């Protein structure tokens, strides 16, 4: 009744998306549903072993936007039989059978359904905002309109392009490239703080941030 | 607060101009100002400028990443910043 | 400097500035840049806008948000 509805509200605001939604819109979307210190984590197994990516609050708007940059024109989450748990200060939601659904546009409109465990922690207050978001992807499917199979039906070169997936584990290149970049850039933010306070060159900022590290 | 896309776009524009100057590409630098019709005033920083300095320590940390350490020459302070 | 990723770092920056100039509509600046730097004109682009713009959007988001 509380956490379940929040995801429905989240799905509902994503239906307002248009191509002109930008930095300010995605930041407003993220402030409505996430804490100022929210953490978001995505997990999957593309090649080699398991990959895990974790980003903080200021990187969370562009994560969601990257899904739309990737071709998605619609995004929603279906949570089948999620487990609630109330604590003194937060509420957990744990859904082993979570589905992330995206609809791509012209041409050859394709639908991507990503399955995984969605684990959430909400703040127990009025704006029941998300403190942690953890999505562990197990597998994904990609669906083709029957009309667009019949379109490229007797065209051997177009019809084997239709057997190639369009995402890798449900992540399109936009999203994957973004999360990987965020590994390097996001702890540079400490360097950037230094730069803003002491007038010091970035490489000296870095030099000085090795200082705290070996010290403790 | 949070920057808009245009604020970010224009800040990148300015710093690429600075980059072009400090890199010995003064011809490109003013061509660029005209092709994008920049009009506001510009004062710039010491070489190599904001973009060059930040890009280069970003690229260092990239190369000093655990998964790229070998097969990518990098500095040691970047390596240890990870650890 | 004497850091050993520097020449590649600066190779890449130049490469991405040129891609940025082309995708931003600065056709002549891009052509001029190449000849001002002694680079043979045979660079193939990514999709618009290139990496420099994408890298910058994340960097500046973090830079603005970075506190004192």
């Amino acid at each position: 009744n509380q956490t379940d509805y929040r995801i429905f509200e989240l799905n509902k605001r994503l239906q307002n998306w248009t191509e002109e939604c930008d930095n300010l819109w995605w930041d407003a979307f993220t402030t409505e549903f996430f804490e100022d210190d929210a953490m978001l984590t995505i997990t999957f197994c593309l090649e080699d072993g398991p990959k895990r990516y974790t980003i903080g609050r200021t990187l969370i708007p562009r994560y969601f936007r990257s899904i739309f940059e990737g071709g998605a024109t619609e995004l929603y989450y279906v949570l089948k039989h999620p487990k609630e748990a109330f604590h003194s200060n937060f509420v957990s939601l744990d859904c082993d059978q979570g589905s992330m659904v995206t609809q791509h546009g012209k041409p050859m409109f394709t639908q991507v359904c990503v399955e995984g465990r969605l684990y959430l922690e909400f703040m127990f207050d009025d704006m029941m905002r998300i403190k942690t978001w953890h999505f562990s992807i197990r597998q994904h499917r990609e669906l083709i309109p029957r009309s667009i199979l019949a379109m490229h039906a007797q065209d051997p070169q177009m019809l084997d392009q239709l057997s190639k997936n369009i995402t890798r584990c449900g992540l399109s290149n936009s999203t994957l490239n973004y999360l990987r970049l965020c590994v390097i850039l996001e702890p540079m933010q400490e360097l950037m703080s230094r730069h803003k306070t002491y007038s010091l060159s970035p490489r000296d900022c870095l030099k000085t941030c090795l200082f705290q590290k070996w010290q403790r | 607060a949070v920057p808009s896309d245009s604020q970010a776009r224009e800040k990148l524009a300015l710093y690429v101009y600075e980059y072009l100057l400090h890199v010995g590409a003064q011809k490109s630098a003013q061509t660029f100002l005209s092709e994008i019709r920049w009009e506001k005033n510009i004062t710039l920083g010491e070489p190599p400028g904001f973009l060059h300095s930040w890009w280069c320590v970003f690229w260092d940390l990239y190369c000093a990443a655990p998964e790229r350490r070998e097969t990518c020459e990098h500095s040691s302070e970047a390596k240890a910043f990870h650890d | 400097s004497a850091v050993p990723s520097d020449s590649q770092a600066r190779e890449k920056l130049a490469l991405y500035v040129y891609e940025y100039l082309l995708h931003v509509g600065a056709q002549k600046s891009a052509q001029t840049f190449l000849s001002e730097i002694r680079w043979e004109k045979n660079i193939t682009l990514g999709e618009p806008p290139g990496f420099l713009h994408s890298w910058w959007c994340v960097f500046w988001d973090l830079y603005c948000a970075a506190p004192e």
Partner: peptide, 24 residues
Amino acid sequence: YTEFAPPPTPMVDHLVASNPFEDD
């Protein structure tokens, strides 16, 4: 010609402005 002028690319092979994270 100002100290931080870019390297030559003695690599003549066709350079690609690809994302430095994209897999090959």
